[PDB]
Ligand binder design. Structure first.
Ligand SMILES: *[C@H]1O[C@H](CO)[C@@H](O)[C@H](O)[C@H]1NC(C)=O
Ligand SMILES: [Zn+2]
Length: 1014
């Protein structure tokens, strides 16, 4: 295995190093506004060395943005695809590329058989080519790598089944900045090439000057280069026709033949296209070939890519004709005029890349190596697209909840083969497709119109219900004596209980377990653990009495804690935000211990008085002018006091101190150790009163953030043996710090209300001497080093925080893990900050046509890990990556893949069993079974189950941490007949494995395996 820590890769371009050296000056470069006046030697091309030009027609189709998926399908996309089928069928030399399989599958299934056959023929013959082949073209900033792989697999599995093709070239022309997670997944999924477009204009200029726009993009930790994927970065400001023929848009716009009047389009540079004729073709060709030869100067081979397309293009039959016939007249002239030394034709993306690599093999070019990412994007001036790292945060959090429910539903149901009447495959395909659709670069990004956001939300709610159905049918089957199991596939044997989604204060969605001597004395509950190691975690349920005790199924008592159910109210009469306790519902909390990829059953039983193994939390309400807070049968009376500082410690864990405003002020790791300053603070950013305004995409603050004025907030302290917490009602945020014996959990119930033109940020202030360095993750997969640059504006220093961020010095590290993607930064040494929500009244001129005024309450979740790192083996100061410690990684897993909780619905569960998975191997802590999916339906004689195995890399800090078992996924199901290593989409077999054993993977590697069972 390669060492991902100690060997700094030697690459030609390392983006952090490039950023440190670049000046980012925004000067007027002439017609290429953000470049320079390109010059070329006319003698470079001649009869023995011609410029080969591939004009690649395309149409950018968004699966929701200004209209919903279905509205665009009906108004635009079905017509584009119907006319592409007709025009390509009738014009053999015409070509077209297509990226979004969600739309193509919607179209293809509605075609009659004759047309399905014509479509398969134009694909098989190379006229219509799929590029990437994912369900969508995903956002690359906020998306989790597991969901980028899920959507890629959904689209490619459909293409293999119906079209018999698997794309090996990727096309990503619209995500707002680009992540190395894409080549990581694509290279492990059979790809050979990829193309990107939205990168900072200063980066395009710098790389163009060195002819480094084509490069072998490897991961930041890859010393050998085996992760490398050839990448083509487009050079100009847009993928539209005016910015794809060459450097001068006033000229290129004349070659977009849809802009002459009858289509309602024109050229803003004021020179319209003119129909090509025999009297003007020489002058028009002279202008176009000049643009092409200028573009060619920015690249190393004699093969040139010229995209020809824009948003929802190629819709009307007359548009297909006007573009095709005019370009055909230009090609016939150009190709017959030797003095141009050009051979131009319509082509596909794969044809371009195959010709580039033929040139490379002929020794005509060598390409530079590159590592790093392409965030944060700016398309012009100081307009940095860091706002969408936070926009519509409710849905960003929903993404992560659904991510986990899809994994858990696919894994729980994979253990058995199911009859078709159970509708398991149907519900899982619906859930995978709605979560996949939301990965779109106007979905999770929060950049769609309000009614489109509602459509994505409704689709995801249906997907969550589908996952719940599959999960509860699977738990009932896995834990019921076989000869007793009698399923009704439409019945709810269990209901899921989720404590953090939508969350307390967001929706009252949880069911109370109703017990009583005259109705039901006890209730079975079941926990699932999707991770491949034994895991303990506190779990809580609402119960109708405080006198409840817990047992495992062998009837062994389990220690439990009961606390009140507290809800916060914005009291419009007293004008204060304060908590109310329930006098008939209570929370019971206990530690569940669950096998690897397994289930564990417990029983909750009511008694007439305080049970021996259940304790009760104390509660203290700090505020001036308190009023009583009765709690029904709860056995401990609420105490009151004036605001004051307080300290809490649960178990042997850290001791946390809080200010009189209920905000953390210090963390003391052990009895002996020091009280380290760690202060939470809430601040607000505003919007500029003149100049450009922040909107869904852009973050354009009117200077550094200002502190939220807190007043004298109400603080609630709950102290228990198993769990303690401090909660405070601040303006727009109920902020909660929860302690269970390890790193605290932070929950913010964020309701920005009607505060227009405001972005609320949560900042941590420490005295850690981090300087200008901080680390943020990319897609939940890797941590990359960031350097704050005072030569760039504040918004350029904001990066996506898809799952975590940290700062450190020689001795101390503070890591904040997140349960949802948000934007953040470290704007000064010792600080971390992360945006909570943003409400903007203005549109930011990128096409959305509205501000962001549809905010709703969201419960954000986090874990805060302060650690000593002086003993850790860390990368050298020149390495571009960082790595988590064991405790930080486990804290991230506690947020993203918590235990699932099921409450048995009926009064009695006949045939109930206590555990499932006790014999499953408990794998080393850095290994995860990211995906477990049965790939065959019940009628297949040979069953197949696919697994994606991911190993992260954790720092070595001196903990012996030992005894774990080897995990061989190919032997998790019995009767194994074959084990194969496959691409990550499961679509191609790469290796037949000896002994039917699937090896574990190396740190930072991901592999897929498929086991076959007789
Ligand atoms: C397409 O798939 C392979 C090449 O990928 C080809 O040999 C096969 O005949 C085609 N279609 C079928 C029958 O799978
Ligand atoms: Zn788009």
């Amino acid at each position: 295995c390669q060492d991902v820590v100690q060997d700094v890769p030697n690459v030609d371009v390392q983006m952090l190093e490039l950023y440190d050296r670049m000046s980012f000056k925004d000067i007027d470069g002439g017609v290429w506004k953000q470049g320079w006046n390109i010059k070329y030697d006319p003698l470079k091309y001649n009869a023995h060395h011609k410029l080969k030009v591939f004009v690649v027609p395309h149409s950018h189709n968004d699966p929701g943005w200004i209209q919903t998926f279905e509205e665009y399908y009906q108004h635009d996309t079905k017509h584009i695809l119907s006319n592409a089928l007709r025009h390509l069928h009738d014009n053999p030399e015409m070509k077209f590329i297509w990226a979004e399989i969600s739309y193509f599958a919607r179209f293809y299934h509605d075609l009659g058989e004759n047309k399905k056959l014509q479509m398969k023929s134009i694909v098989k013959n190379g006229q219509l080519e799929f590029v990437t082949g994912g369900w969508v073209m995903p956002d690359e900033a906020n998306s989790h790598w597991r969901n980028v792989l899920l959507q890629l697999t959904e689209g490619q599995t459909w293409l293999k089944q119906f079209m018999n093709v698997t794309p090996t070239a990727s096309w990503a022309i619209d995500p707002f900045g680009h992540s190395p997670t894409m080549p990581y997944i694509l290279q492990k999924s059979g790809f050979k090439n990829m193309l990107i477009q939205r990168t900072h204009y200063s980066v395009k200029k710098e790389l163009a000057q060195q002819r480094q726009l084509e490069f072998l993009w490897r991961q930041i930790w890859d010393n050998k280069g085996d992760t490398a994927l050839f990448t083509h970065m487009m050079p100009f400001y847009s993928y539209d026709i005016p910015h794809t023929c060459g450097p001068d848009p006033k000229v290129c716009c004349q070659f977009d033949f849809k802009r002459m009047g009858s289509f309602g389009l024109s050229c803003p540079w004021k020179v319209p296209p003119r129909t090509i004729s025999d009297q003007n073709v020489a002058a028009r060709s002279d202008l176009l070939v000049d643009q092409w030869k200028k573009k060619a100067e920015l690249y190393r081979t004699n093969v040139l890519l010229i995209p020809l397309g824009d948003n929802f293009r190629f819709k009307q039959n007359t548009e297909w004709d006007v573009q095709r016939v005019n370009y055909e007249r230009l090609f016939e002239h150009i190709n017959s005029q030797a003095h141009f030394n050009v051979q131009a034709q319509f082509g596909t993306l794969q044809e371009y890349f195959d010709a580039v690599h033929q040139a490379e093999r002929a020794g005509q070019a060598e390409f530079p190596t590159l590592s790093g990412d392409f965030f944060t994007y700016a398309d012009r001036s100081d307009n940095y697209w860091s706002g969408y790292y936070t926009s519509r945060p409710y849905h960003k959090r929903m993404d992560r909840v659904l991510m986990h429910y899809v994994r858990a539903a696919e894994m729980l149901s994979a253990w058995h083969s199911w009859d078709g009447m159970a509708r398991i495959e149907e519900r899982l395909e619906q859930a995978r497709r709605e979560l996949s659709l939301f990965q779109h670069h106007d979905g999770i990004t929060g950049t769609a119109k309000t009614h489109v956001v509602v459509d994505y939300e409704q689709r995801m709610q249906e997907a969550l219900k589908a996952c719940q159905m599959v999960m509860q049918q699977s738990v009932y089957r896995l834990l019921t004596k076989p000869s007793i199991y009698s399923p009704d596939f439409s019945f709810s044997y269990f209901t899921l209980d989720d404590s953090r989604w939508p969350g307390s204060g967001v929706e009252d969605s949880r069911t109370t377990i109703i017990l009583g001597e005259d109705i039901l004395p006890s209730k079975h509950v079941v926990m699932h653990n999707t991770l491949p190691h034994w895991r303990e975690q506190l779990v809580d349920f609402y119960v109708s009495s405080p006198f409840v005790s817990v047992t495992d199924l062998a009837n062994n008592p389990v220690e439990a804690q009961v606390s009140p159910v507290w809800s916060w109210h914005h009291d419009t009469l007293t004008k204060t935000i304060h908590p109310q306790g329930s006098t008939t519902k209570y929370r019971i909390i206990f530690k569940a211990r669950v096998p690897p990829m397994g289930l564990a059953t417990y029983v909750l039983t009511i008694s007439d008085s305080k049970p021996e193994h259940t304790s009760y939390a104390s509660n203290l309400l700090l505020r001036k002018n308190p009023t009583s807070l009765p709690l029904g049968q709860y056995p401990e009376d609420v105490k009151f006091g004036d605001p004051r500082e307080i300290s809490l410690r649960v178990g042997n864990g850290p001791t946390l101190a809080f200010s009189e405003q209920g905000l953390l002020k210090s963390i003391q790791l052990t009895q002996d150790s020091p009280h380290v300053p760690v202060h939470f603070k809430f601040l607000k950013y505003g919007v500029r009163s003149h100049g450009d305004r922040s909107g869904a995409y852009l973050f354009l603050p009117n200077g550094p953030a200002s502190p939220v004025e807190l007043g004298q907030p109400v603080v609630l302290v709950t102290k228990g043996k198993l769990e303690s917490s401090v909660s405070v009602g601040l303006p727009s945020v109920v902020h909660q710090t929860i302690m269970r014996g390890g790193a605290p959990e932070i929950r913010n119930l964020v309701d920005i209300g009607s505060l227009d033109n405001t972005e609320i940020v949560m900042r941590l202030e420490t005295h850690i001497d981090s300087g200008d360095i901080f680390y943020t993750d990319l897609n939940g997969l890797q941590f990359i080093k960031r350097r704050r640059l005072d030569k760039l504006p504040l918004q350029a220093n904001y990066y996506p925080i898809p799952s975590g961020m940290f700062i450190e010095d020689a001795n101390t590290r503070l890591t904040l893990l997140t349960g949802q993607p948000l934007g953040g930064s470290s704007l000064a040494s010792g600080e971390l900050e992360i945006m909570q929500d943003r409400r903007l009244a203005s549109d930011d001129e990128r096409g959305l046509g509205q501000g962001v005024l549809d905010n709703k309450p969201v419960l954000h979740i986090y874990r805060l890990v302060l650690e000593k790192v002086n003993n850790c083996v860390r990368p050298s100061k020149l390495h571009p990556a960082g790595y988590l410690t064991s405790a930080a990684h486990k804290a991230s897993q506690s947020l993203l893949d918590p235990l699932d909780k099921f409450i048995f619905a009926e009064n009695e569960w006949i045939g109930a069993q206590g555990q499932f998975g006790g014999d499953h191997p408990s794998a080393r802590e850095d290994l995860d079974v990211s995906v477990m999916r049965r790939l065959t339906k019940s009628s297949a004689k040979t069953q197949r189950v696919g697994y994606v195995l991911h190993r992260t890399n954790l720092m070595q800090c001196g903990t012996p941490e030992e005894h774990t078992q080897k995990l061989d996924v190919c032997h998790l199901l019995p009767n194994v007949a074959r084990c194969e290593r496959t691409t990550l989409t499961f679509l191609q077999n790469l290796e037949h494995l000896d002994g039917m054993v699937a090896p574990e993977v190396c740190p930072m590697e991901t592999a897929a395996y498929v086991s076959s069972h007789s």
